[PDB]
Design a binder for these strands. Structure first.
Ligand SMILES: Nc1ncnc2c1ncn2[C@@H]1O[C@H](COP(=O)(O)OP(=O)(O)NP(=O)(O)O)[C@@H](O)[C@H]1O
Ligand SMILES: Nc1ncnc2c1ncn2[C@@H]1O[C@H](COP(=O)(O)OP(=O)(O)NP(=O)(O)O)[C@@H](O)[C@H]1O
Ligand SMILES: [Mg+2]
Ligand SMILES: [Mg+2]
Lengths: 440, 447, 440, 447
DNA sequence: TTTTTTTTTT
């Protein structure tokens, strides 16, 4: 089959570049040398780009001279071909439209070539599984989507930013929320400082092991799921889904987790758990993935799948950042952490969803006399601090000091809040129920 | 070209369904009639599904009669073809694998057809823009992804987790395990907090040298072996198997370890040891691999081999983690510890067996005024605290303080317990027999 | 000529694997894919290994499907060939013997190929010397012998452990060895505790070179040689043959080493040296072969070479164990010393020789406040604290402390001892003649 | 194929034996009749051996008569063939090399025949197991190695090493004659441990920049030149010969080098320098080559040239090895350093002269709290430690620490000494004259 | 070789 191309549009673009050099910027922004169908056209555009990068004006004589210097004058068709191309183009008024048509043709041919590669891989598995071929096809499709999504980037005037800002301000003012700007946390004090879980925010609640960090994250997930209808997504890499469900049942029904774990439960608590399960089946918005060692690309694919199937995602829960595995940057832990944080922040900005990702800390907290967590106390910190916008720290003096009077009191200390002042929220922790409640 | 198909696997599936009707459910869950390459095979599977939904058993005569009544007997090839299909298939033991093969072939053919459609759309835009074709291709790829490893495998859901949780809770309530849901530790106090050795748990018993850490681990192994029939696996990397067995005989027969080490044993203790050996040969559930510096891959291979041979593994014993060596991450000890911990937790989740991994402590324990071991006092903890769920620390103030009143009292402090609160279980240690027993003295409070 | 192969045995093995999957472990232990003569059989066994490692049962249909997915179904002969192979094999009862025959054929073909390579090297020297050709031939034959190895590990049954333990108990109790059990060490305290130089043992003394450790090993060699005529071997990496000989003469003759080195002409020392060398000639088992810069695999090869020469090794003296520095592990010496110790223990079990090494510690022995050889004084601790079966540490406080607390009671502290009580073994040392005596 | 042989070398050997009978001993020691490829050559060598053992001189006529009496004259080719063999050989000066070539050819032919036998045994096991064939191959290769056992050998056995022991005792009886066994260093303490500069020794004196390494090397050169008459050779690659001469004049005349460099010198020090120059012109045993970037081949050629012209070389000075450049191994510095060290060691063994080869250090020394240099601290270490025998390191704590009490005290620490115990030689450094002298202060007992 | 920045531990 003949590949879809428009050689006449390429000739018009090249002739307009020969005539006009001010509209060269539009052509350079729109298309590249690879977008031209014929290889001589690619060479011509490459020579034009090299001349314009040097600051030389784009004319027939200098272009032919440069092609002869590189020996490419004879390969492209000769100087007579260049003169014919210069003659053919009347004007460059619609050269942007011609470049758009050329880019359309190039994208279509790229899609056709990728489809041919997919068909070849299908006919020749070469020992690959179906999942590998599916992942390769999805990767190629996303590569084409990224290649087409390149015209969005561009420096815009302050007027457009002002119009978007005043439109958003009018939208916010016309929509009554009573302090609930983001997803409702279920805690009154948290809904005053943070004013809800804002979308496209990296929520970092890092704490020590056996501090109720997973428990508090689960409580936040439960409160959000009860206070919203948008489906949530849980990635419990470390904790099994069975333990997560047991903790959820203990927290929501206010029943001791020990009796649930042993299974020694009375029929009244059984009925309470049954009612909680009925409420959950009424919601059916929770999807817990217990797989561990997942790259952020897989997490992004799963999030896109759930958002496409279920109409967006209310919340994305991550077990903690120190359990995520990237084969590419597995050599250095800090580089891996930075890449994971960057990918998760890009995903959160992409789908406009608050992502609750926990983390661990460092031993220096125990080294300090005061065991209040700081930014440097975070395990492999820095890029975590930079990429995230809402970082909190769980503090429990009851754990450190047996004589502490803060027993039951958990201090969620906001390590970082870009929009708004940071603080410390006191809550009531029930170890038996594993329930975090508003402290009176 | 020729579409990728496996007619032989389809014939094997059809013959196995004609022979075996109990494995129909796996075939129905895995594949449908559309997964069959040939249209007669689609007809055959459709008729099989129709007969099975009616409750009719799947045999040759009833299927032939049903195809004759619908007139599809000649469409599928005839009764002789069906008889040939029934004859060719030897057994239906691997019919699940054949169904997986058919599903793979159908998925690849679907992918090829979708690629052909996308190429046709590319060559013929039909007025659609690039964005329209891209969205169509994305929709087709998403449909294929929804037709392969979709929620039928259950990657992430709520209702399935609820059903599994309520089934487990009902099973635990009906089971008269009486507190000990996991593998029995042989210690009543330990069976109250930890509720026995739960499967897929990384058990960390950390102690200073000469604290009877390996002694207590072997006591737990002996208690589990006497309280279960599932075979255990011991990796005595640090100590030789001779010393381990001598300590085991001293603990079980309650004979002085020094006398055994000198060999000067009377005939009464000799008869007690012989009876213990007879009990062990009755069990024969203990396999000790005293190879040192083992990679976790070798340990995983040995565990899979033993589980295949002896029908699972009850317990996995590891003799202190810093002896285990990973040549890939031998450059940095913390990376080695993290890799070992991750691989051991993956193995514990894989085979559903409680892994008892011992560990050492830090020198900061001597530096602090209170010598009770904490999580940070672990010898290069790192991911040890994160991956494990049953971290414990042996405390012997008798060793630290000569004037301590806790002589024989060894305090096992639970550093981390994910499910349940933490505490301190005191036990009676007998250094002569090297025996840890339940403390029957005054019940001190876990402060 | 036709290479020696048994295709029928290969067909029987493949058909038995198709019939029986339980005996797959025996075939995997016995042979590999390379042992199959024909390349299609190699591909078939490779596909079988890939299927069984995935957990899939090995049958005809799945194997054919996997070969078709990899495209190797047409290469091996087609599905009909596989069906014929499955049909031909009656049973898998004797598949172990068939696999042994296949392994024998593969080893014989390997030997034939190696002989052809040696003949080619002989015909075309390519500038190599005859010594190079001989070393290459020895290396090739050693590689064949190493490839002719078998299973070395495995979780032992409880019955075997019980038998070994009761044998050890009977050895400790019944046997009236009265101190010495193996080769006599010479030191009375070492005679009691270490029970002599036990064959197939790893005795590593960790101290400073030319600081009493070298003469300690020399006295060990002398005492071993005075009570047996078994050929002992010298592998001193510290001092040459002449200097070691001078040290040995000074130690045995009780003559000041200043007179041994700097010639003080007298007939009393000459008569003592004459008597010493007469006793040495009476023993007639000291074969000098000291060198520098080797690996314990080379030491094992030389042990086999000496066993070919004479047969039986009484003692190997490894002076300056830190002179085998591998540049890859020269910085962190702990792992290198651990690997060397493990290979030396393997060599000791191989030829039944009490392998004794002289590990070098750090300068902190004279610098740290803890003058005794503790983990700070040990070379990055690690392999000096553990691994080695007999890690003796020479606390010679004479060198460490100017006003020594140990003069004639210098402590041979044993960190780990398989047979004998650990502790500080105080021994007398004569600095004048470089002679280590035995303190009561 | 054709077996590898050199008939021409055999003919040269036979002709040289026919001409020269004094070199028969070397031929008998090296080769036998079996090393001759042709059977007539074997017969000829057998007759030659029989005649020489009988005491008969080896000439053409007597050998022809001896072959005629045994009837082997016709078997070897006749008298004309023997006359041709006697005619063809010009001289027997290189008959030892010809015998070595013949022995090499015989060894290769024996190896080929053994390989043929082993391949024949491999193709036809004749009931032998794989272990039997392996042991047979090992025995055959060991027999080939045993054919040259007296040639390829290392340390000797008990009786031979005892004879070497008593011989060395008799030799070291003569050792207390001067104390210095090699070239006198001029330093009493250095002449105790090292016993002077031993010939065929690679002396690596490595230090930090501006540590007096070149200064101390020049002091050693001056001491050797004043204590010997054999000519020395200096390769001042780093510094020009002008600075070298200024340092030499400052050291020998004990005048400040700063005043010499500025030229502001009094007439008394001028007369001292003139007397020193008169002493040097009396000696005239110093030859400096200040060219930089020189290959070891050029250095070896110049050394052989000087040894031929001036009757050997007393000392070879190299101004630090990393300045030496090899165009072939310029891609990798470590390979270049190893090649340079190997070539210099080969040259030192060739001419039997101690070579003064300086070296630089690494920056890991300043990283360490104790700045005492070690063997691994050497710049591009490894092969340097292997090839050299007299490695020393200069330590000056006065440079590192301003409050150090070792001002003027420079410690030469021996890192490697194959023949002798290593130690720390303290010296007194005079920066003004740049003079290294024996440390006359209180001796420090090295802890 | 060089050169940065993170954890852990002694
Ligand atoms: N039945 C119970 N009674 C009392 N306390 C309990 C009970 N069950 C759980 N807990 C407590 O709940 C907390 C669980 O904390 P958790 O969030 O699991 O730690 P974590 O930080 O998430 N683990 P990790 O993220 O891997 O470091 C601990 O403080 C337990 O003591
Ligand atoms: N007139 C002087 N007065 C005092 N000190 C001096 C004088 N002249 C030289 N020095 C010292 O002498 C030393 C010169 O040593 P020198 O041997 O040239 O260094 P180097 O080892 O060759 N450098 P490098 O080759 O990079 O290792 C330095 O410590 C100078 O400070
Ligand atoms: Mg958690
Ligand atoms: Mg210099």
């Amino acid at each position: 089959k003949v590949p879809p191309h428009s050689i006449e549009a390429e000739q018009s673009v090249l002739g307009g570049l020969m005539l006009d050099n001010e509209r060269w910027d539009d052509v350079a922004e729109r298309v590249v040398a690879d977008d031209f169908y014929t290889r001589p056209h690619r060479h011509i555009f490459t020579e034009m780009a090299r001349l314009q990068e040097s600051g030389s004006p784009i004319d027939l004589i200098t272009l032919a001279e440069s092609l002869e210097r590189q020996g490419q004058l004879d390969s492209v068709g000769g100087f007579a071909y260049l003169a014919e191309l210069s003659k053919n183009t009347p004007s460059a008024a619609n050269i942007s439209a011609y470049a758009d048509i050329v880019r359309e043709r190039a994208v279509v041919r790229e899609m056709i070539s990728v489809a041919n590669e997919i068909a070849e891989a299908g006919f020749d598995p070469q020992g690959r599984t179906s999942e590998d071929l599916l992942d390769l096809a999805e990767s190629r499709v996303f590569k084409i989507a990224e290649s087409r999504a390149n015209k969005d980037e561009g420096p815009k005037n302050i007027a457009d930013v002002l119009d978007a800002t005043v439109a958003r301000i009018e939208q916010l003012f016309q929509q009554p929320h009573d302090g609930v700007t983001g997803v409702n946390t279920g805690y009154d004090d948290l809904n005053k400082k943070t004013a809800g879980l804002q979308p496209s925010d990296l929520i970092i609640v890092a704490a020590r092991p056996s501090m109720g960090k997973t428990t508090f994250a689960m409580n936040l997930v439960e409160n959000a799921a009860m206070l919203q209808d948008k489906p949530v997504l849980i990635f419990s890499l470390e904790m099994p889904s069975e333990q997560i469900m047991m903790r959820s049942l203990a927290s929501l029904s206010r029943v001791d987790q020990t009796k649930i774990r042993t299974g020694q439960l009375d029929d009244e608590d059984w009925a309470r758990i049954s009612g909680t399960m009925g409420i959950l089946l009424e919601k059916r918005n929770i999807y817990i993935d217990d797989s561990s060692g997942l790259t952020p690309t897989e997490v992004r694919s799963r999030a896109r799948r759930i958002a496409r199937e279920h109409g967006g995602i209310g919340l994305i829960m991550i077990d903690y950042l120190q359990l995520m595995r990237v084969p590419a940057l597995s050599d250095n832990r800090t580089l891996e952490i930075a890449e994971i944080s960057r990918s998760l922040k890009a995903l959160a900005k992409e789908l406009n969803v608050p992502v609750v990702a926990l983390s661990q800390l460092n031993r220096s907290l125990e080294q300090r006399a005061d065991k209040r967590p700081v930014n440097s106390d975070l395990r492999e910190s820095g890029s975590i601090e930079q990429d995230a916008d809402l970082i909190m720290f769980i503090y429990r003096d009851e754990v450190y000091h047996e004589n502490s009077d803060l027993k039951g009191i958990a201090e969620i200390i906001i390590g970082k809040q870009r929009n708004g002042p940071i603080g410390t929220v006191r809550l009531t922790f029930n170890g038996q129920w594993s329930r975090f409640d508003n402290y009176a």
